[PDB]
Design a protein around this ligand. Structure first.
Ligand SMILES: [K+]
Ligand SMILES: [K+]
Ligand SMILES: [Mg+2]
Ligand SMILES: [Mg+2]
Ligand SMILES: [Mg+2]
Ligand SMILES: [Mg+2]
Ligand SMILES: [Mg+2]
Ligand SMILES: [Mg+2]
Ligand SMILES: [Mg+2]
Ligand SMILES: [Mg+2]
Ligand SMILES: [Mg+2]
Ligand SMILES: [Mg+2]
Ligand SMILES: [Mg+2]
Ligand SMILES: [Mg+2]
Ligand SMILES: [Mg+2]
Ligand SMILES: [Mg+2]
Ligand SMILES: [Mg+2]
Ligand SMILES: [Mg+2]
Ligand SMILES: [Mg+2]
Lengths: 86, 137, 191, 118
RNA sequence: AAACUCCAGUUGACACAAAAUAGACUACGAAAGUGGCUUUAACAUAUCUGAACACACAAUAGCUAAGACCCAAACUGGGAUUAGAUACCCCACUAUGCUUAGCCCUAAACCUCAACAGUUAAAUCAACAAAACUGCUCGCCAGAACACUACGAGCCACAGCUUAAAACUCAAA
């Protein structure tokens, strides 16, 4: 309200391609967490519920990163069989 | 020169022009995309209103207002009244995640207006008023 | 609900009876010609009457549409007609307990004070066989609690082959209420 | 202790800006402060519009005053700055150069088991 | 549907309300709690253990008095749904959530892990939870239900809190 306008969350359109500009803006707002923030703010999430989801999200991210690391490590041996017939 | 998605900063010397007008002089299309309606107001750089259209003023009622085709129709209506007043290039400022968020912009284009930039001004309180309680569905 | 607002550019019918912003009758014309008028004069289209066989629409400005919409809401506030009569219904059993029948009787009373119609159905109970006249007694017990507040809209009638009776109760009309007060007063003078 | 006053002044001409600084440094001295230095950070556009004393501001003069004062002088100085109409925004912080930074060897790895366990 | 139509959109001015991102961090505090900024004061104990009641605290809700009031919101009112709907769904608005001064003293107040010290070798270990144990101390428990009840006593509590039985009943829980 007190800030300058047309700087925050502003994307310029190139060659009249408004679809690509809108996708870029939506990608920016998504990566910065504003889209999820807006949605969670439509109804009040109670503090005990916010902590539960934040705890669930943090444990799921760790579990997925740890499961990705394991598969990357165990995919080194996905090469062809060196001792076929034995 | 390479294309910059960052808008030109006022007071600096840019080479970009639209019909001989600088970015600071292009009129603004304000799109409020609500969950049950979409409102579009086109204003000049001096904040002079030029055109207003919403799904309700285009003859849509109740749940039909909260549709993309209703917002697209509202955009076409606002574009027509704005084009008569001399508007070609507009800066789009959309607030809200309603169904007419993108469709309202398409209608502005189909109505003869050229969008040079898109700005999101969806209100996000930094801590603000308590929203209504969750719904049991 | 039907709202007094701009119909828009897409008109439902093809042939449209049109009027002027000042009320001058422009006659019947095709919807394509009406849209051209709305743009040439910068006016909006409202629906004044739909009952007429030729659909009647009128051109109006946003200011006019507002004044009429304001006018109408000042009339309805002055004359708030209670349009809908709501038919509440209660399905009872012959062997219903007194505590349950007293609870449902208090509920029927509250519906009558709100000027609703109460359809009461009484069905034969489980493991219980009853004379159809005995089932009819419950109707007189329910209405006895409302001596001067309710009366049979439709008298008890056998339904489903006589398995279950039916009925409809209503609130007494103002004339019927003054008659009850009159009759009650005469008895007071006699006693 | 040693404090740092971050002072944003109303954009004024040189004579009125000097009168504001002198009047502000004398207020510190009147409250027992020992003023160490005065730094000009330059006039710039504010990061946002600031309303102060029934006026709207878009530019301001940024100044720093490094000084020593008793702990009781801070409360009284904050009150003085609130009444000076030529001050847009004034904040007194503990001087950052007093706090000594502790040495760091590096980023020790944290076991993932503790993350989910914690 | 009701509701509003001194309504809505842009722009400007604007709080005694609430504190995006950081925070994927795991810190501070006895616990309860604590996540905008600044400053002041400031986070007991050079052996441990040690209280339903002593001493001091203790979320939310609630009480008494005076204030603030954006938004949310029991109750209530209206709309709709329904066989009914004292609900779930929609709208409005109040107590209340805030401040100040007093109370009240409860929680699934829960890592559902008592404090301190020690061990990783024995048998690893009913099961699940959270690898299995030792020393030492305090608190507590002894079938279910009756019973977060009765009576007594204490309490700023008066439809309250704390402590807390018995009779009848069962062969389970
Ligand atoms: K914050
Ligand atoms: K727990
Ligand atoms: Mg019905
Ligand atoms: Mg001790
Ligand atoms: Mg204790
Ligand atoms: Mg004891
Ligand atoms: Mg206790
Ligand atoms: Mg408390
Ligand atoms: Mg309170
Ligand atoms: Mg409200
Ligand atoms: Mg109701
Ligand atoms: Mg209130
Ligand atoms: Mg506050
Ligand atoms: Mg807790
Ligand atoms: Mg202990
Ligand atoms: Mg027992
Ligand atoms: Mg209890
Ligand atoms: Mg008790
Ligand atoms: Mg007692």
């Amino acid at each position: 309200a007190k800030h300058l306008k047309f700087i925050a969350r502003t994307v310029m359109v190139q060659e009249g391609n408004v679809e690509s500009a809108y996708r870029t803006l939506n990608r920016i707002l998504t990566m910065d967490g504003l889209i999820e923030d807006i949605k969670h703010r439509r109804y009040y999430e109670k503090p005990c519920r916010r902590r539960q989801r934040e705890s669930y999200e943090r444990c799921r991210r760790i579990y997925n990163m740890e499961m990705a690391r394991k598969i990357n490590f165990l995919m080194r041996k996905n090469r062809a069989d060196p001792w076929q017939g034995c | 020169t390479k294309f910059s998605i960052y808008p030109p900063i006022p007071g600096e010397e840019s080479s970009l022009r639209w019909a001989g007008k600088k970015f600071e002089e292009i009129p603004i299309a304000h799109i409020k995309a609500s969950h049950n309606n979409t409102q579009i107001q086109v204003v000049s750089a001096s904040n002079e209103p030029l055109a207003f259209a919403s799904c309700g003023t285009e003859g849509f009622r109740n749940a039909k207002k909260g549709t993309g085709i209703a917002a697209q129709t509202a955009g076409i209506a606002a574009a027509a009244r704005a084009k008569q007043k001399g508007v070609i290039h507009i800066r789009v400022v959309v607030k809200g995640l309603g169904p007419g968020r993108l469709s309202a912009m398409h209608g502005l284009i189909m109505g003869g207006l050229e969008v040079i930039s898109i700005t999101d001004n969806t209100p996000i309180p930094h801590x603000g008023c308590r929203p209504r309680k969750a719904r049991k569905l | 609900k039907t709202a007094f607002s701009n119909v828009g550019r897409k008109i439902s019918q093809r042939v449209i009876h049109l009027f002027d912003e000042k009320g001058n009758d422009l006659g019947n014309m095709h919807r394509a010609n009406v849209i051209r008028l709305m743009d040439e004069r910068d006016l909006r289209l409202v629906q004044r009457n739909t009952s007429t066989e030729p659909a009647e629409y009128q051109l109006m400005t946003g200011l006019q549409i507002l004044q009429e919409r304001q006018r109408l809401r000042e009339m309805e506030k002055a004359n708030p007609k209670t349009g809908p009569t709501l038919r509440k219904e209660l399905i009872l059993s012959s062997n219903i307990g007194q505590h349950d029948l007293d609870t449902k009787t208090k509920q029927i009373q509250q519906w009558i004070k709100k000027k609703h119609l109460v359809q009461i159905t009484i069905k034969k109970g489980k493991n219980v066989d009853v004379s159809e006249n005995e089932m009819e007694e419950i109707f007189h017990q329910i209405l006895q609690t409302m001596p001067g507040i309710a009366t049979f809209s439709s008298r008890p009638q056998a339904v489903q082959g006589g398995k279950a009776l039916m009925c409809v109760l209503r609130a007494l009309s103002k004339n019927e209420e003054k008659a009850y007060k009159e009759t009650q007063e005469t008895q007071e003078r006699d006693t | 202790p040693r404090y740092e006053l971050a002072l944003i002044l109303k954009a004024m001409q040189r004579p009125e800006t000097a009168a504001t600084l002198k009047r502000t440094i004398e207020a510190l001295m009147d409250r027992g402060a020992i003023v160490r230095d005065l730094e000009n950070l330059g006039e710039r556009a504010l990061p946002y519009r600031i309303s102060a004393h029934s006026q709207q501001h878009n530019r301001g003069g940024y100044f720093l005053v490094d000084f020593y004062a008793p702990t009781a002088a801070v409360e009284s100085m904050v009150e003085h700055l609130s009444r000076d109409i030529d001050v847009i925004r004034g904040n007194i912080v503990k001087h950052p150069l007093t706090q000594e930074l502790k040495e760091c060897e590096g980023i020790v790895p944290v076991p993932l088991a503790e993350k989910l366990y914690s």
